[PDB]
Amino acid sequence: TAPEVLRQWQALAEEVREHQFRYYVRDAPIISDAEFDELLRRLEALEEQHPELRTPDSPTQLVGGAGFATDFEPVDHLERMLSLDNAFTADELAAWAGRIHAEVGDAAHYLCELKIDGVALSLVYREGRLTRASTRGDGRTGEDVTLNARTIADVPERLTPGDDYPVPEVLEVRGEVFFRLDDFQALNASLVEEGKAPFANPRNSAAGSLRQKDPAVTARRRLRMICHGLGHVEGFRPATLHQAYLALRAWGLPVSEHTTLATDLAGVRERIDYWGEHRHEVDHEIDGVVVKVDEVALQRRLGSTSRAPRWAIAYKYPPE
Amino acid sequence: TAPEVLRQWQALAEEVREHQFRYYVRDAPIISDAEFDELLRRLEALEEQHPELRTPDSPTQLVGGAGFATDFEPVDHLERMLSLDNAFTADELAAWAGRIHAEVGDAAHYLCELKIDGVALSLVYREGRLTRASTRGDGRTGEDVTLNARTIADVPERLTPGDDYPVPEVLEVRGEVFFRLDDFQALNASLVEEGKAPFANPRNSAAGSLRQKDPAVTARRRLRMICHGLGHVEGFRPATLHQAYLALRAWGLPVSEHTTLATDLAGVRERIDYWGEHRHEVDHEIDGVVVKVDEVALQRRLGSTSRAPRWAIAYKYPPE
Ligand SMILES: Fc1ccc([C@H]2NCCc3[nH]cnc32)cc1
Numbered sequence: 322t323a324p325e326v327l328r329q330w331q332a333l334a335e336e337v338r339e340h341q342f343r344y345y346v347r348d349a350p351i352i353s354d355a356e357f358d359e360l361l362r363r364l365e366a367l368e369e370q371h372p373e374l375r376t377p378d379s380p381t382q383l384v385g386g387a388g389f390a391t392d393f394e395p396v397d398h399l400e401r402m403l404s405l406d407n408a409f410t411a412d413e414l415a416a417w418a419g420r421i422h423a424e425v426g427d428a429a430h431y432l433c434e435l436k437i438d439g440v441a442l443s444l445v446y447r448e449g450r451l452t453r454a455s456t457r458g459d460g461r462t463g464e465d466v467t468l469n470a471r472t473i474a475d476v477p478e479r480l481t482p483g484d485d486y487p488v489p490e491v492l493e494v495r496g497e498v499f500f501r502l503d504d505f506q507a508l509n510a511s512l513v514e515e516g517k518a519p520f521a522n523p524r525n526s527a528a529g530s531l532r533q534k535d536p537a538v539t540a541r542r543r544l545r546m547i548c549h550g551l552g553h554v555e556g557f558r559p560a561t562l563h564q565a566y567l568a569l570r571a572w573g574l575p576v577s578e579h580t581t582l583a584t585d586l587a588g589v590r591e592r593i594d595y596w597g598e599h600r601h602e603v604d605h606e607i608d609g610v611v612v613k614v615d616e617v618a619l620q621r622r623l624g625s626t627s628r629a630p631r632w633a634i635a636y637k638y639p640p641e
Numbered sequence: 642t643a644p645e646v647l648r649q650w651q652a653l654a655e656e657v658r659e660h661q662f663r664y665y666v667r668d669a670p671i672i673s674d675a676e677f678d679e680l681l682r683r684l685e686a687l688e689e690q691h692p693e694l695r696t697p698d699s700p701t702q703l704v705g706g707a708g709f710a711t712d713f714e715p716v717d718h719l720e721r722m723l724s725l726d727n728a729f730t731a732d733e734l735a736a737w738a739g740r741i742h743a744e745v746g747d748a749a750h751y752l753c754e755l756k757i758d759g760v761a762l763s764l765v766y767r768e769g770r771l772t773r774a775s776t777r778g779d780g781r782t783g784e785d786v787t788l789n790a791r792t793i794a795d796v797p798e799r800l801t802p803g804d805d806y807p808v809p810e811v812l813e814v815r816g817e818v819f820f821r822l823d824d825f826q827a828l829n830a831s832l833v834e835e836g837k838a839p840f841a842n843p844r845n846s847a848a849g850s851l852r853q854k855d856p857a858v859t860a861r862r863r864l865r866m867i868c869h870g871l872g873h874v875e876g877f878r879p880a881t882l883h884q885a886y887l888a889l890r891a892w893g894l895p896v897s898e899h900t901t902l903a904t905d906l907a908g909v910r911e912r913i914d915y916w917g918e919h920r921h922e923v924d925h926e927i928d929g930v931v932v933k934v935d936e937v938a939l940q941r942r943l944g945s946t947s948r949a950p951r952w953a954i955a956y957k958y959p960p961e
């Protein structure tokens with residue numbers, strides 16, 4: 322309870338708890354087994370002198386690999402997380418553009434990005450450490466799957482600091498989790514080989530593998546992630562979406578290489594026509610193409626309706 | 642950028658930054674000057690090997706006591722933080738009760754607490770560490786005065802763990818900052834003695850002393866705090882307000898000893914009549930008495946209107 326006592330304990334209980342998590346759940350320690358033994362002794366030493374600090378929730382009382390379960394507790398998104406209106410025909414996308422060119426004039430360019438057919442995940446970083454990950458839920462509230470998301474190889478626990486782009490104080494970033502096709506099939510064979518039913522498609526597999534009461538199951542599966550939107554942010558004010566991606570890259574978040582910037586509708590349509598013909602070559606499932614006004618100020622003059630942003634639209638291919 | 646590298650740096654940059662803050666701003670280190678020198682060497686060592694990790698925002702680049710200023714940046718409250726309707730006459734408080742007894746029947750008891758005439762402060766603890774403090778603003782958004790609140794002796798940086806009450810994951814707690822009368826006068830003399838104008842009353846003094854661009858000014862002043870409400874909480878579901886105070890005590894947050902629990906209106910009125918006669922004996926300013934329905938479930942069946950809770954009311958004395 323004395324101030325240095327409490328700073329010491331938290332910092333060490335946090336460090337050992339992490340390591341417990343990486344060893345047991347993710348089967349991937351980042352320190353030796355020896356170093357870890359130093360750490361846990363110290364925290365039990367320190368808990369010896371001050372028995373206020375041994376609680377049922379202490380890393381020293383969650384010893385094997387216990388205390389690591391997901392329960393999907395409702396958790397609020399910082400910002401709304403709405404779902405995207407859809408366009409299925411050349412006329413609707415044109416109509417969307419017309420409307421968009423009638424409000425924020427000719428200052429709006431269009432970021433074009435591949436729509437992945439996986440599970441939306443919202444992640445929150447507080448001063449460069451990953452604090453929360455949740456599912457969409459209803460847009461305002463989703464479910465806590467933080468432990469499962471911590472096993473996804475693509476999801477750094479901590480953001481990488483660099484000269485050009487300082488780590489925000491708060492960063493809420495949205496992305497899609499998905500399986501590569503070759504891994505979807507390999508997981509299905511492994512499951513059948515245990516007497517378990519296989520998944521009918523990669524989306525269900527990713528959703529199923531994300532939503533595991535026991536996150537060690539998720540850590541055994543080769544789930545992936547690609548960031549594709551920002552929610553609430555502090556200490557970060559990017560002027561465009563395409564430039565925010567550069568910062569995300571820099572901090573170590575996964576971002577797609579099939580994003581292009583288009584000037585006017587005609588550019589948009591070539592990208593849609595292009596990926597209509599070549600999407601089958603991406604190693605993961607592509608639904609369509611999400612067209613967004615790239616300029617953030619224009620993404621405020623245009624707003625969102627109660628259910629969907631007015632500055633973006635998902636063009637969806639017909640399947641077959 | 643390797644995982645243990647980033648965990649190491651953050652944990653150490655966080656530890657030295659704190660210590661810098663306590664030494665320079667608060668003039669109150671909690672470790673020796675020697676220990677601190679060990680810490681800062683290490684972080685500069687570690688920053689030597691990995692020059693990714695020396696940024697303009699690193700404790701090793703904010704060396705004297707720099708980088709510690711308040712700028713009042715807007716920050717959102719987790720939960721709404723509304724202001725309390727007022728009652729000035731026996732008839733209005735009766736009317737309020739009648740209405741309250743007509744909706745949640747005779748199951749509602751009334752917590753009665755002294756209304757302090759100071760500055761509302763909302764604090765946010767994330768797993769037992771103080772993350773944010775802000776002013777009321779408009780109820781939804783207030784101003785970031787986190788550094789100033791970190792100097793208030795009454796505000797633990799970290800919550801104390803105990804058997805009976807586990808530290809919530811998130812705790813947003815509201816309270817009032819204020820001066821004792823003897824310290825309001827002493828501060829006024831010290832200011833006049835420097836050629837500065839004195840404050841006309843203790844509330845303005847507390848508000849002024851809280852809102853300092855340079856938090857070291859706040860640390861020099863004997864500001865106090867008393868918690869008196871909960872906003873958003875996670876890992877904490879108290880059945881009543883009076884029992885939530887017990888947990889707050891236990892975790893080390895300051896709470897008032899003049900809170901009483903009343904059964905029916907008649908009890909409420911004796912407390913108001915009592916403090917009408919004895920408030921002048923409290924060493925700080927008392928406005929009135931805030932009457933709240935103590936049962937949290939009844940604090941949901943009754944809700945809040947767009948501007949004020951329906952389950953509470955501040956009775957205000959006439960001044961003189
Ligand atoms: F009896 C043991 C043996 C090994 C450990 C290790 N498992 C915890 C975290 C970690 N990190 C690196 N090794 C370890 C714990 C208890």
Ligand SMILES: Fc1ccc([C@H]2NCCc3[nH]cnc32)cc1
Nearest residue numbers: 660661664665670672673674677
């Ligand atoms: F040149 C110096 C001398 C002393 C310090 C100390 N000031 C920083 C934090 C702290 N904590 C305990 N002592 C110190 C820093 C630089």
